[PDB]
Design a protein around this ligand. Structure first.
Ligand code: HEM
Ligand code: HEM
Ligand SMILES: [Zn+2]
Ligand SMILES: [Zn+2]
Ligand SMILES: [Zn+2]
Length: 172
């Protein structure tokens, strides 16, 4: 019953309910799967996750998690820019692809791929919602969304740069 999801995550013709609800279309299976399991075992405990995903995840078994992961991964069209213009695309592009050395900000593409397509456990960011990206970078920077990799990666990202990388990524 994907309509246990689509109310919020939207549907082929409707975006997600709010900027903080990430698009799922085309997200990699292993990633989707990891998140759903994290929500289920509460390992991903950032605020929005606790509030809007622990509940629904609690009613998911290994089989459904995988079924769902598969479903959204195949969804078409994969998560795309809504068309809403976000300032900083250029800035964010340089950050995503080149990172910022003196600020010790890693080049995002090394893990998220040449253009935010991601791969397996490394999530696609291309086409993700602007607010959602900023929100997750905030959670990673905050430490409220626990992930050794991203907690370390987000350590030096400022709110301003989060917006740039978000603008860029959500425009893809
Ligand atoms: C069983 C159906 C659902 C599935 C499979 C599902 C799956 C997911 C996945 C895999 C993510 C993480 C995406 C990412 O990291 O990019 C996510 C995030 C989210 N979902 Fe769902 N979801 C479902 C239903 C819902 C519903 C019904 C709501 C609203 C009550 C909801 C609200 C959210 C929100 C707000 C987030 C982002 C939370 C956060 O920042 O941690 N989801 N969902
Ligand atoms: C400043 C560059 C980077 C930015 C802006 C960035 C941004 C993000 C965002 C917004 C997410 C959340 C995706 C979602 O919820 O759908 C994410 C997840 C992730 N990123 Fe990055 N990232 C960057 C660099 C990296 C690097 C260099 C690595 C590998 C060392 C990495 C590994 C990951 C992994 C593994 C996840 C998924 C975490 C999980 O399993 O829950 N990221 N990243
Ligand atoms: Zn895949
Ligand atoms: Zn957007
Ligand atoms: Zn700080």
């Amino acid at each position: 019953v994907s309509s246990d999801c689509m109310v919020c995550h939207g549907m082929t013709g409707r975006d997600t309910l709010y900027p903080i609800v990430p698009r799922l279309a085309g997200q990699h299976k292993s990633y989707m799967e990891a998140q759903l399991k994290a929500y289920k075992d509460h390992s991903r405990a950032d605020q929005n996750g606790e509030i809007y995903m622990w509940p629904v995840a609690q009613a998911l078994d290994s089989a459904k998690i995988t079924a769902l992961a598969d479903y959204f991964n195949a969804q078409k069209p994969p998560m795309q820019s809504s068309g809403i213009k976000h300032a900083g695309a250029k800035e964010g592009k340089a950050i995503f692809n080149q990172g910022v050395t003196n600020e010790q900000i890693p080049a995002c593409m090394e893990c998220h791929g040449s253009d935010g397509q991601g791969a397996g456990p490394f999530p696609r960011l291309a086409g993700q919602r602007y607010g959602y990206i900023i929100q997750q970078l905030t959670y990673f920077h905050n430490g409220t969304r626990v992930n050794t990799l991203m907690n370390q990666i987000a350590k030096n990202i400022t709110v301003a740069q989060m917006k740039d990388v978000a603008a860029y990524l959500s425009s893809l």
